[PDB]
Structures are given as C-alpha cells and as structure tokens.
Write a protein that binds this ligand. Structure first.
Ligand SMILES: [Zn+2]
Lengths: 93, 1109, 195, 207, 52
C-alpha cells in the first residue's frame, strides 16, 4: 500500500544497513569456469545464488532447503531473483 | 535504333535530335576515371586534354617525391597495376566472398648520400573492382555507392540585415578542401573583423600587416573606399613583429613566440600544401570568380596571397554595390552576391572521389608509419618492401564499404528500383548536411534544377528534398558540376550543334522551350517565343534575343517520372507518390507490358542490365531454360547463363527466361532474355486490367479497392517470394555442437523429410514450426526433477544430456525448400573464426492476392483490398465480360489526379483497335495525327511521351472512332462510358459508367508479412518487457499518448492492467496466465519491475527513498 | 539565499553528515549484468568498470597508509579516490569525463536517470504489452457500429489461453498441454469453441 | 602511482655498498611494479599473470612474424614458433577475449540500445509453471492412490513426497522387509503402472 | 540473439509448514556488533565466520 514517497539524504549507517556484504576485491567473474569470485563485484555470497535454490559448493541443491546459509561457502539457498534485490557497500579508506 | 524493339506506335509530335545517353554513365565513367583505364584516357584525350592523370595516379603523385627530416633518402610511388579479378561474378557471389583484384604499385628508393637507386613492385592490397552493372560485391552481397551533394570550395560573398538596428553587414566565407576556414566581415561599426578560425575576431588590417605589406602600401590599391579609409586610422600598429606577434598570441595564446616561428606558423596553415589545400576545382572556381590566372593551367592547389587581397577588394566593391570590378593583371569580372544552393557551387562527389578520399587517408597514415619506421633501419640493406606496411590503406578501404553510410544495399525490388538507386543523389552522410540539423530551407526547388535534378522524385519521409534522382540527359563535368545539353540557335534558325552547358555558363544566355514551333528548316514560326531568363524566371522574348533551346521536353524529369503517362495532368504531389511507388512493385509470375505507356519503358529495361543482350550479330544455335548459345558471324560461339529463382536482397524472385527460338538471327544489342519485370525488352511492373469508375455498396469506401475473384483464379497477381534461413554449428566449452537427423524428445514422424545428415530434403513442404536442421548441443544438466525421473523411468526415454536446439521455420512462414548450401571447416572454407559448420536453407512460396494487400496505379492512387468478390457479383458489360477492379469516384477529384481517367480511356482505345474513316479528308481533330496512327489492330500498344502525349481532342476522337467487338457493336460510347448490369440484382445501372483498362502494380507492402500478434512468450532480459520487432511474438508498444487517452477516458483499472500485469509484473504474469487457464479471478497487480529498479537506482545514488503509508 | 539553504536542515531531522560519505553503495549486479552472448561474447554495463576504478584506488590507498608513505603520495592517492568517486556518482560535472575504448564517455549513475534516456524521461513513458496485435485495416460496410472484424489466425492465437481452457472443459483435450498442441496446428474442431 | 610503489620497493633494496646508482637499480623495480599492475587489473576479466604472459607472447609473435611472409599469421604459423599446438593457441585466443558494453547505441539514432533485443533464456514460461502443477495434481494425486502400500514405496523410492531419493535397503528397514523385498515390490509396481491402460493418461505430457 | 545469465530456473514445490530444522549460531565481531546464521541439521558448529 502506497500513500506517499519520501526522499531523504542517506547517511553512512543506512548505506551499511542496505548491504549484506562488502566488495573487497575488483574482479567481476572468473575468466575460467565462468563463475563469480569469492569477493568480487558478482559474488554469490553477497547478492545470492545464480541458480534457483542451489549452492556454490553444490552441497545443497533442492527446495528441501531454503533460507539455510551454507557452512563452507556462505551462499544461502534461495530463489535466484534476489540478485536484482540486494546491494553492496564499499568502505572507503 | 534498337534491333529488337517491339513496334509501339507513339503520339510523339516533336523530333528527337539527341538520343537518350547511357543511363549508368555516371557510375561507370567515374570508376573508370578512378582506376585510370586506358579506355578512359582514350576518351579524355579527345576532349583536348594533354597528359591526363587518373585519380589513383593523382593520389600517388601527391606523395611523389617523399623525404625525411634531413633529406638523406627519398621514397616514391607510381604506376598502379591490376592483374585480374580473383574469381567470376557468379562464383564470387555464391561463395559469399568479396569481389576484388590485386593492386600493385611500383615503389622507388633513392639514397642522396650515396646515389644508389632501386625500384620494385609492392602489393598494396586487393581493390574491390566494380562490376559491369555499376555495383560492387562484398561478402556475397551487392552494394551501390550513392553520390553526395556538398558545397564546392570557393569564396562565398554573403549579406545580412540586423533586426535591432536595420543595418546591413557583409561577409566572405571561405571553406577549404582541408584545414581551417576563415571569413571576412564588415561590422555595423565599420570594423572589418576577420575570424581566422574558431579563435576570436580582429581587424583584417592586422591580418594584412602580419605578412609583408607595410602601412604605406595599403593606400596604393584601396584609395577609393570609405570603410578602409576609416579602418586605416581606427587601428594603430606599425611594427610587423608586433602584428605578427599579436596574431601569434591570439591564435595560440600561452605559447612562446619567436620572430621566425611567427612567419613559419602562418605559412604552415595557408600557403603550404601539406596542411592547407584547395583541390583542382577550388582554384578553378576562385580564379574564374575573381579573374586571376586567366587561362593558365598552372598546377597550384593552395592559397596565394594575391587572391586574398583580391577577395578583400571584391568585398569592398560589393559593399559599395558596383556592377563589376577588375584585379590589376587579371580580367574584368562582374560583382554580385553568390547563391549558396545554386548548382554552380553545389557539386556532387561520385563513387570515384568517395573511394579516392579513403585511399588518400590510408596513404597518409601509411606515409606517417613509414616515416617513423625509416629511422631505425640502415641505409644499405633497406628496401621499400621493408619500409612499407600496407595495413592502413587496405583496412580503411575495407572499412569504407562495410561501414560508410553512402554504401547501401542495392534496392533489388525490381529493375527500375535498382536503376534509380544507382542514379540517386544524397545530401546526407559524412561530409554533408548533418542529419541532426537538416535545415528546412535547402529542401525547396531552386531554378537551376531544370534538366539537372528531378523536382518530382523525393522520399516522402523526413528525408524530403534532401535526396533526389539525377536527370535523364544529365552528365557530370570532370570537376563535379552537372551539365545538361542545349541546342545552339542562331539568327532565327535552330542549328544541329548540341552543346553541354553548366549552370553558370548557361546563365549567360537565353534558353527557349522545346515545345515551341519551328519550320522545316528550323525557323521560329511565332514572332514571340517563351524562354527562361537569368533570374531563373519565365519570360517572352522576340526571335532575335533567343540564344539556346532545350533538347527535348523530357529533359527536366528523371527516368521513373518519365514512365508516368499523362504526367502534365497530375499535380506534383500525386506524381511524386506515383514515382515513389513505382519502385515498390514486386515482379509477378508472368510479366505483361502496359497497353498505354511512355516511350521510355524500353530503355529503362535495356540499361537496367537485367535483360540478356547479344554481344555479336549471328544466329541462335540452341536454346534452353538454363542457358542460351549464339553463333557469331565471325566463327565465334558465345554462351549466356540464365539466373533461375534467385533470391533478391529484399526477398523477391530474380527470375530470367528466354524469348528467342532456334535459328533466329539476332543483332548486336538485341534482348535475348527477359528480366523479372520485362516483356519483349520493355519494363513490365504490373498488369493492365479492366476498371470501372463508380462507388459500389461502400466496399470501396475511403479509397479502398475491390477485386474480381478472376485475378485470384488465374494467378494474374501472384508473386514468388524466397526466404533464406541460416544456422551455424560451433563449439562450446561443454562440448561441440553436432548436426544430425536424430534429436531428443520428438516423434519419428517429425523427422519425416530430414536427411541422415539432419538437413531437410529439397522440394519438401515445410509448415510453421517444422524442423529445417536438427542440431543438438551439450547441456550437461544431470539433476532432473523427481517427477521427470519417474516419467523417464516409466517409459523408454531413460535420459539424455543434450538439447534440441534445432532450426525451425518462423511462426508465420511456410513454403517449399528450393535449395540448400553447406559450408564446413572440414574443407577449410572461410568460416569466420568461431564456427565449425554453417547451413543455409531457401524456402520459397507463392502468394496469391488477398484481402489487405496494397495496389496502386502510376498516379498515386494506392489502396488496400477491401473485398474480393465472385466473378458473378461483378458488374459486367452487355457483351457479358465482368469488370476486374472498381475504384471509388469521390477520390478522383479531391485527391486531384485526373491523369488516371485519361489513362483508362486510352487503355480502352488500345485494347480494342481503332480506325478513322477518310471520306471528306482527315477529321479536323486528327489534323496533326501521324499517318501510322490512323488505323491500328486490336490489342495494340501505344506510346504517349510525357509532355508530348495525346491531347484530349485526339483521344476524344479515338474514343469516338473505336472498332466493334465480335458481335459488331460498341460497348463504350464516344464519351468513354458504357452501361453496366448489376451482378447481384441483375438490373442495369440507372446511368452509364466509365470503363477502360488501367495498369496497376502490386506493392511490396504486403499483408502476408505485416500481420503479427502476441499472447504470451519471450521477453527482454534487462528490461523484463516483451521484446518486439521482426521476431515472432513481437509485442506492441503502449506509448504515452495512449496513456493520456486512457486517462481522459477515466479508465484507471485498464491502465493499471496494461502497465503492470501485461508488461513487467514478473510475479503477476504467471498468476494471471494460470488464472485464465483455470478460469479463476484475475489477481490484483503487484509492484512493477520499473518502480523497483528506479528505487534501487535512487538508493544507489545515496538517496534514502523510503515509502510511507 | 543562505538562509533558504541552511533552514532545510534546521529542525528537519536530517543532519548535514549525509553529504560526506564514509561508504559508497553498490547497485545490485542484475542492473549491471555480465551476459554471455552467442559465440562466447561477454557484455557488461559501464558501471562495472567505474566501480572497479574505485575499488582499485581505494585498495591501493589502504596499502599506502600501511607503508607510511610521504604526504605527497597519500594526498595524491586521496585526490584520485575523490575524483573516482565523483566520476562514479555523476560523470562530467568536473573536468573531462572518463572515457572507455575508442572515444566515448562512460555512463555514470546520474546518467541513468538525468538525460534523455533513463527512468523519468524514457522508460516510464510507455512500455510494451502482451495480449496485443497489429494489422492493416479495411472497410467493412456490413458491420454494426459496435462491431469489428478480426482475422481467424490472429484471434485464435490471441485468445489461445481461453481457447485451451474451454477445449479442456469440453473434454476435447485431456490436459492443458494437449489442448495447446492441438491449437498450435489449428485443428478444425476448435473454431466452434473460439466462436 | 604504481611507479611510486615500485620506487618505494626499490629504495627498500638499493645498496650503496655495490657502488651502483639509485636510478639504475630502481628502474627495474619501477618497471616490475607498473607492469605487474597493468597486467593484473587492466581488464574487466582478470587473466592471471601467467596467462597474460603467454597472451603477450602470442600477440608479439603474431605482430612480428607478418613481415616474414606478408600475412597475418594463422594458427599453423603461430604454433610453428610458439612451441605449442594449434588447439591450445585457439584456446588462448578465446581466453584473451574482452567484454563489450551494453550502453552502445545502435540503429543510426540515439534512441535504441545494444541490449534492448536480448532474449532471456532463463525467463519463466507461465504454461510450464501451470503444466507441472497439473502433473503434480495428476501423478502424485491420482495414479499414486491405486495400490496402497505397494504404491507407498514409490513415495520414498523416488522421493516425490520429500525430494530425497532413497535406496532399497534404506526403505526396506522402515518396514520389516529386506532390500530385495523392496526391489520385488518395486518391480511389481513398475510392471503394473508401466502398462498402457494407466500410462495413456500420463504419457501426453512428453509423448 | 539469445542471452544467458550463468543461472537457471526451477519450479518445484515450495512450502513453509514443513522445513528442515535450522541450527542457529551467533557470532560476535571485532567491531562490537553481533550477527546470526542458521545452519543445517548436520549439527556443525563453525567457530569463525565472515559477516555482512
Ligand atoms: Zn555451499
């Protein structure tokens, strides 16, 4: 439901809150095997999986598990549509 | 003239003193000049020219001699060569490779420090040699080069008034071939401020002081002017170094000035060929405009300081307003302001110069690279081949054809379309009028277009005016100015000397109209003759005043506009529309020449190159549908191959067929085979059929058209169309892609017409969605869903690890496979990198006319097909023949094209023979009718030359003197009307209706390929919106004005549905589809992707857009 | 004027700290995707480049502070970091714009919505829609004022979902996919349902 | 800046005791740092140092060998001097590829973009989303409810009820039967269900 | 042309009333903040983690 749209000036804390991870590395995708890197601009750990309800290490690949965060690579099994819904932040020096 | 021309009686009353010249000379002659063919030098020499130079030889002579920084050694180029084309035209086109021939230039090296010299040939790439039909073939596609209209170099005197102060100021803009421009000025305050470049303005006195002339010299030659009288005392500077240094600082502020570089830099930008250059044309124009170097053929091609002071002198004289002036040493010349759109300074650069520009750029870059590479190498073992790297020139030539906006797919919709594409003139493209600006003022007709550029033929889109076709009789002067022929006339007598004149040189004389009368000797019968005059105006003058005359009435119209009978009875708008539409006529299965037409239809075909012609007189030996053979009279045998069912660039059929029989004695230049739109060597773009002008039950309301079912039964308007599908098999990182008959998840009956190698059989009929080529590709996704596992375990389809990505017919296309081609890396075919195999399949289909098709006449009367009616529903003449087409009456007068009525009446006169009795002499209305027109048989053909056609009196007499039918009666009275019987009720119509035979076309804007619609299917990735365009399931666009209309209706819910559910609501589309399939209630729409993406963007910009409730 | 500017912060709750940044957000990847095209081509939005120009210049700065480099080095690094962030947010308002291969300036975040293209001016004024068709029009003199004639093929394909629903309802097809396949080839016994 | 880093690392090794000049020693380290950075982060896709090395070798050889014959070297000529076989050379050439930008404007106007006509291969198709549900309402709901406990094995064997497929013995021990008994009842169920009389309804999904 | 995303789509039965048992752990960070992570039934207890 929509009543009005407010446009404030975002502070540092809001920017930190909007992000589930920090981009600590400048690579986009691996030149070989064509997958996102562990800390790159396309990392699955930050923006979610690229395959529906799958995992980076392949240990979890079914809707049998959803919302579970993997204990070895950090990617949570969830719909792939989250990759257009989650943001990241860069902490400036 | 033409041996095989069918006898077509013509209404022509005037005689032709000059036959129509070649219709493709503009392209071929320019190309021959570019390559410098000896067969072009032989003609250039005849023009009284000594030691003519080819264009490429000119480009090489520009860089001849070459030198380095210290002139230790010099390089040189000369003598381009051409060995032979790599392959034939047909082989080059079918092997989708590029037509070209090797180019060799002989290079020479001289050592100044030692005197050692050497020379050898250097391979300088492969040059795309032109074909005989004036086209190039690149990557298996035929392309044409369209000339570009531009502003010629010279001095442009101009004037303008000031709105605020009502003062007039003058300027002299000078545009060079290359470099930086400059312009004089006369400010309202009398300050003569030059803007030497995009830099700022200063008085011209400083410009003149900076080079040579002192303070006391200026008074010698300009001691009769007021503005300079004031200027010589308004300014204050006597030191040449100061003026030089002042101009140096203002030109390049912030740089260290020196007393020698001050002269060095100014000389490096106006008076040196390596930076600033005016072409051969520029010097000619400047010299004749100002009278300098009268008659001298001097080769100078860059500014001369004498001409600059002559320019300021001319400006001074013009500001005063004197009629003429004279430069000391030159000749007397007139003083006037120059028109910028006048074709005396607007010039067209053709294919030759367009190619030469790119060659020049490539050679310049190559010269830069070689002058860099020279330094490292030694001075004994060095050779030109080691020095030169031909990469830039070849790369730039190859980039020109494949990327230049002036290289265009040839419009192979019909022979006339291609013929009028090669002769097109364009103002757009690089180096011309920027498409963003597109000034509205330059689009209108200027009085100099007469006989040079057609005023009727232009695109009807936003490109109106900017693009037009060349005239029929026009030829291009070597300088790039369009000439036109005129008959020399003398003291009341017309002579046999035809002279080509340019616009400027024609402006000096008086030119009379062609239609004016003359006696047998050539004397003017009438005392006062109507002529044209210098202002581009129409006046009357006595006999003594006349000085020239036009060559023929058709001189001012192009080829296409010339093929419209009774053009003078049609307004310019409808004539333009008809000329444009004549280029959209699709060829039919069987061609039929118009019953009534111009005399041009013949040549427009022969010069189009789509009709096989005899190369030598002789006898036909053997004739076959695939090729013809002829035996010359000098013991020589020639063989011509005929193209069959070939695809055109636009999808039509480029069929050819013979017209000769064994034992026929042909003559040189005689048509042997017909092109797509040809019959007996005459252009046949459509069909002539029976038409009656009358409204009919509203089915033809608002310019719609009604057709008899006969035209569908006997395939009168059926056309063949061939599409070309492709698919390439190429490797991937999970495995290679294979072409095979077998593909997963299909029945064996789906593969009925598939070879063992996957490709469909030749001649097999393919429906929508059928398989043309089976191509499985690696998938490797092993973890199938448990339900699929169970199903595949139940049945025999255990499992597979590959996809079914086969090539399938587009949803909407169907036909029969007429051909297949396969290219494979297995035999080292030139497959572009990254491809293993490639297969092309041709699918051809016949198309009968149907509802929604578009037909038009030659007079801009196009319409859709509202209804096709049974033969028994059509109105029929008393003899019983039904009418084929019926056109609404109300459209004829308001749209204002009466030429179609005369066309219909003369078509009836031609269909049924005519004869006029001679008892009391010839009838008065037939006093001037030629003898051969007195009597003609049935189903004859007539020619009505444009601007010399049959006057309405002669046509009325012909209507009144028609012959009867088989029953000895006349169906159409002397007024061109006949009674008609209603096919529905049977009662005769209360009043007579006008009937005849009209020649109609079939336009390529068919309904068979424009209908499309979408329910649900593929979308766009990034935008999450349904994609559109040519592809299947192309969605429609709900623009902004549509939203405004919905808002005005107050349709809040429908607007939301059209904006969220049906466009970009990813979670809503599936739910709506499943609700429809289940019949449940439609769920309310959710948040569209657009708003979410906008919110995320604004958040990314560190703006905390928070939604409130 | 200075009052009209400052009073915005007065009693508005938003402190002026917002206009000094300690962390720069990253737009979700799908709005700057890395797409594999046919033949192995990859395509990616210019944003990915600009972001890297930050993550690089920041990272090196994180190193330069560790090494204790002279004042000049660190000052230059921080100036480059500020310039890179400025280019990332809105390119071209300062100095010359950062350009990619050839001669073309990269599109920044502000360019996504400020120019002729973008959400506000381009993407929000109309969009493509499903369940729609187009075709030439002809005169029907036999029509009532509230009637219009539609081609058989267009109407069938456009009503496909309702057609399948009714076909499966009347036992002509055992399931939705069977009705779909039947409609694909326009089987004769569907017109009585389409009507 | 990277040259400055190289200078720093040079100064932490310049040794006066050898008598050499600072410039002579520091030039090498400056080049090292600058080239390492330029090969590490000059591409959107990071081709590692060892791979960009061989890529540069291939590029230089291709550029240089042209003067020997006047042609751009092909895989045969390149392999004849790179000491590697043509297929590896092709792989290297593919690996050296770089991504283009979607924001380029195509169509002779500044209205369309390269990216508007990108068809999505992952986009959900509604019909399938419906069809599967129907199958879930036709396979699991109807055909399963025809053999009671004999059909119960299919629920665990194929994991239709949970998604975890089970081995024979693993579902033999939930009841009081051996793995081979589970195999036998599974064979009975497969024989009975595979018969056309019931498969006629289920076949039409991918017949 | 057809575009790819290095991903895929699946449509199997989602639900919430039947779920695998989470094992929830919490981690304290050197900056003073705390976070939570739900793990699977494997009963693993990782000692270290990298947080948001
Ligand atoms: Zn994992």
């Amino acid at each position: 439901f929509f009543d009005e749209l407010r446009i404030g000036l975002a502070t540092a804390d809001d920017i930190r809150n909007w992000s589930y991870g920090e981009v600590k590395k400048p690579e986009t995708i691996n030149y070989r095997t064509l997958k996102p890197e562990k800390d790159g601009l396309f990392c699955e750990k930050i923006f979610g999986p690229t395959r529906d309800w799958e995992c980076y290490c392949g240990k979890y690949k079914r809707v049998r598990f959803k919302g579970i965060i993997c204990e070895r690579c950090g990617v949570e099994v969830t719909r792939a549509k989250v990759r257009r819904e989650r943001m990241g932040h860069i902490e400036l020096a | 003239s033409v041996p095989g021309a069918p006898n077509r009686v013509s209404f022509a009353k005037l005689r032709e003193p000059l036959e129509v010249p070649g219709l493709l000379d503009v392209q071929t002659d320019s190309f021959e000049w570019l390559v410098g063919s000896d067969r072009w030098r032989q003609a250039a020499i005849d023009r009284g020219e000594e030691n003519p130079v080819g264009g490429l030889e000119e480009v090489l002579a520009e860089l001849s001699p070459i030198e380095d920084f210290s002139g230790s050694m010099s390089l040189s180029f000369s003598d381009p060569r051409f060995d032979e084309v790599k392959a034939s035209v047909d082989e080059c086109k079918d092997k989708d490779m590029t037509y070209a021939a090797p180019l060799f230039v002989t290079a020479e090296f001289i050592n100044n420090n030692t005197g050692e010299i050497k020379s050898q040939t250097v391979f300088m790439g492969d040059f795309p040699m032109m074909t005989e039909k004036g086209t190039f073939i690149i990557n298996g596609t035929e392309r044409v080069v369209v000339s570009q209209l531009v502003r010629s170099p010279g001095v442009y005197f101009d004037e303008t008034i000031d709105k605020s102060t009502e003062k007039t100021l003058h300027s002299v803009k000078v545009i060079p071939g290359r470099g930086a421009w400059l312009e004089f000025d006369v400010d309202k305050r009398d300050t003569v401020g030059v803007r030497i470049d995009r830099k700022r303005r200063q008085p011209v006195t400083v410009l003149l002081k900076a080079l040579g002339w002192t303070n006391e010299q200026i008074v010698e030659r300009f001691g009769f002017s007021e503005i300079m009288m004031g200027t010589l005392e308004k300014d204050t500077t006597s030191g040449t170094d100061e003026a030089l240094l002042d101009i140096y600082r203002k030109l390049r502020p912030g740089e260290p000035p020196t007393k020698e570089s001050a002269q060095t830099l100014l000389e490096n930008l106006f008076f040196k060929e390596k930076r600033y250059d005016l072409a051969r044309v520029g010097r000619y124009k400047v010299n004749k405009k100002l009278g300098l170097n009268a008659g001298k053929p001097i080769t100078s091609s860059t500014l001369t300081e004498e001409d600059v002071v002559a320019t300021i002198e001319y400006l001074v004289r013009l500001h005063e307003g004197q009629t003429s002036m004279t430069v000391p040493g030159g000749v007397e010349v007139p003083v006037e302001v120059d028109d910028i759109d006048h074709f005396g300074n607007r010039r067209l650069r053709t294919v030759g110069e367009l190619i030469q520009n790119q060659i020049r750029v490539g050679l310049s870059r190559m010269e830069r690279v070689v002058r860099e590479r020279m330094t490292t190498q030694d001075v004994e073992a060095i050779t030109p081949q080691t020095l030169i790297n031909i990469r830039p020139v070849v790369a730039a030539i190859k980039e020109f054809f494949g990327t230049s906006q002036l290289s265009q797919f040839m419009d192979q919709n019909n022979p006339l379309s291609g013929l009028t594409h090669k002769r097109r003139l364009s103002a757009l493209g690089p180096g011309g009028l920027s498409r963003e600006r597109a000034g509205l003022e330059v689009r209108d007709v200027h009085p100099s277009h007469y006989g040079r550029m057609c005023p009727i033929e232009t695109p009807e889109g936003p490109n109106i005016g900017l693009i037009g076709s060349l005239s029929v009789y026009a030829r291009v002067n070597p300088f790039g100015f369009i000439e036109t022929p005129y008959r020399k006339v003398e003291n009341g007598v017309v002579t046999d000397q035809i002279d080509y004149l340019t616009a400027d040189e024609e402006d000096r004389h008086v030119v009379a109209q062609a239609n004016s009368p003359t006696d047998e000797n050539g004397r003017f019968t009438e005392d006062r003759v109507m002529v044209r005059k210098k202002g581009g105006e129409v006046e009357f003058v006595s006999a003594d005043q006349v000085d020239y005359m036009d060559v023929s009435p058709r001189q001012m119209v192009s080829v296409a506009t010339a093929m419209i009978p009774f053009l003078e009875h049609d307004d310019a708008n409808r004539a333009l529309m008809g000329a444009n539409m004549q280029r959209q006529a699709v060829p039919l299965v069987r061609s039929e020449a118009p019953l009534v037409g111009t005399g041009m239809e013949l040549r427009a075909a022969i010069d189009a190159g789509d009709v096989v012609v005899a190369d030598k007189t002789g006898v036909i030996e053997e004739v076959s549908a695939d090729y013809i053979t002829v035996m010359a009279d000098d013991g020589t045998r020639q063989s011509y191959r005929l193209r069959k069912f070939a695809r055109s660039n636009h999808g039509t059929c480029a069929n050819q067929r013979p017209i000769v029989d064994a034992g026929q004695r042909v003559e040189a230049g005689q048509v042997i085979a017909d092109g797509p739109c040809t019959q007996n060597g005459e252009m046949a773009l459509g069909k002539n059929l029976l038409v009656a002008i009358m409204p009919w039950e509203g089915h033809n309301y608002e310019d719609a058209i009604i057709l008899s079912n006969r035209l569908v039964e006997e395939d009168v308007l059926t056309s063949i169309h061939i599409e070309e599908h492709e698919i390439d098999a190429r490797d991937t990182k999970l495995g290679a892609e294979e072409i095979t008959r077998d593909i997963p998840n299909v029945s064996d009956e789906v593969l009925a017409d598939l070879d063992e190698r996957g490709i469909v059989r030749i001649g097999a009929e393919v429906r929508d969605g059928d398989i043309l080529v089976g191509k499985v590709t690696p998938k490797g996704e092993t973890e199938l869903t448990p339900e699929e596992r169970l199903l595949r375990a139940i049945f025999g389809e255990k499992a597979r690890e590959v996809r079914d990505t086969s090539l399938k017919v587009p949803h909407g296309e169907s036909g029969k496979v007429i051909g297949i081609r396969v290219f494979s890396r297995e035999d080292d075919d030139e497959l572009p990198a990254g491809v293993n195999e490639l297969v092309r399949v041709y699918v051809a289909q016949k198309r009968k006319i149907s509802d929604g098709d578009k037909l038009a006449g030659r007079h801009g009367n196009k319409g859709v097909i509202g209804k096709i009616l049974p033969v028994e529903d059509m109105p029929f003449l008393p003899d019983g023949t039904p009418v084929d087409i019926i056109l609404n009456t109300h459209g004829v007068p308001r749209r204002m094209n009466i030429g179609q009525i005369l066309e219909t009446h003369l078509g009836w006169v031609a269909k049924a023979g005519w004869n006029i009795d001679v008892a009391a002499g010839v009838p008065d209305w037939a006093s001037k009718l030629p003898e051969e027109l007195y009597s003609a048989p049935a189903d004859s053909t007539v020619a009505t030359p444009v601007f010399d056609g049959a006057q309405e009196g002669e046509l009325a007499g012909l209507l009144g003197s028609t012959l009867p039918n088989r029953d000895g009666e006349v169906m159409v009275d002397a007024d061109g009307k006949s009674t008609l019987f209603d096919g529905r009720s049977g009662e005769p119509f209360p009043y007579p209706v006008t009937v005849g035979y009209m020649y109609i076309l079939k336009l390529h804007h068919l309904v068979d390929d424009k209908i499309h619609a979408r329910s649900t299917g593929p979308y766009s990735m990034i935008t999450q919106q349904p994609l559109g365009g040519k592809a299947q399931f192309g969605g429609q666009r709900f623009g902004e004005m549509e939203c405004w209309a919905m808002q005005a209706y107050g349709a809040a819910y429908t607007l939301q549905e059209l904006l969220t559910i049906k466009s970009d609501d990813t979670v809503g589309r599936v739910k709506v589809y499943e609700a429809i399939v289940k019949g449940e209630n439609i769920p309310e729409p959710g948040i569209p992707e657009s708003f979410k993406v906008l919110l995320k963007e604004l958040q990314s910009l560190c703006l905390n857009v928070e939604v409130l409730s | 004027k200075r009052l009209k500017v400052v009073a915005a912060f007065q009693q508005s709750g938003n402190s002026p700290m917002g206009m000094v940044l300690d962390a720069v957000p990253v737009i979700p990847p799908e709005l700057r995707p890395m797409v594999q095209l046919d033949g192995g081509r990859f395509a990616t939005s210019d944003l990915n480049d600009l972001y890297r120009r930050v993550i690089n210049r920041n990272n090196r700065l994180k190193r330069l502070i560790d090494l204790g480099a002279p004042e000049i080095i660190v000052n230059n690094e921080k100036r480059m970091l500020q310039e890179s962030v400025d280019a990332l947010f809105d390119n071209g308002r300062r100095g010359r714009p950062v350009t990619g291969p050839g001669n073309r300036p990269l599109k920044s975040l502000s360019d996504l919505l400020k120019g002729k293209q973008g959400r506000f001016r381009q993407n929000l004024l109309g969009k493509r829609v499903d369940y729609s068709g187009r075709s030439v029009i002809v005169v029907g003199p036999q029509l009532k004022l509230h009637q219009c004639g539609l081609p058989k093929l267009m109407a069938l394909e456009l009503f496909k979902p309702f057609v399948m629903k009714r076909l499966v309802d009347l036992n002509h097809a055992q399931n939705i996919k069977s009705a779909k396949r039947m409609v694909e080839r326009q089987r004769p016994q569907v017109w009585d349902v389409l009507e | 800046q990277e040259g400055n880093l190289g200078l720093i690392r040079a100064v932490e090794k310049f040794d006066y005791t050898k008598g050499y000049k600072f410039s002579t020693y520091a030039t090498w380290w400056i080049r090292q740092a600058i080239t390492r950075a330029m090969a590490d982060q000059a591409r959107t896709i990071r081709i590692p140092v060892h791979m960009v090395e061989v890529i540069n070798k291939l590029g230089r050889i291709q550029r240089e060998l042209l003067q020997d014959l006047g042609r751009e070297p092909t895989p045969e000529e390149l392999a004849k001097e790179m000491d590697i076989t043509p297929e590896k050379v092709l792989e290297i050439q593919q690996y050296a590829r770089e991504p283009i930008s979607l924001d380029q404007t195509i169509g002779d106007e500044g209205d369309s973009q390269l990216g508007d006509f990108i068809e999505d291969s992952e986009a959900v198709v509604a019909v399938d989303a419906v069809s599967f549900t129907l199958l879930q309402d036709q396979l699991q709901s109807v055909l399963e409810t025809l053999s009671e406990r004999e059909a119960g094995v299919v629920r665990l064997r194929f994991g239709l009820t949970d998604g975890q497929p089970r081995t024979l013995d693993e579902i033999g021990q939930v009841y009081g039967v051996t793995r081979e008994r589970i195999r036998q009842i599974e064979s009975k169920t497969m024989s009975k269900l595979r018969h056309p009389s019931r498969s006629q309804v289920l076949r039409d999904y991918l017949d | 042309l057809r575009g790819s995303r290095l991903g895929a789509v699946s449509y199997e039965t989602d639900r919430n009333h039947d779920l695998a048992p989470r094992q929830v752990a919490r981690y304290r960070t050197d900056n003073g903040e705390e976070f939570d992570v739900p793990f699977a039934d494997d009963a693993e207890i990782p000692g270290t983690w990298l947080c948001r």
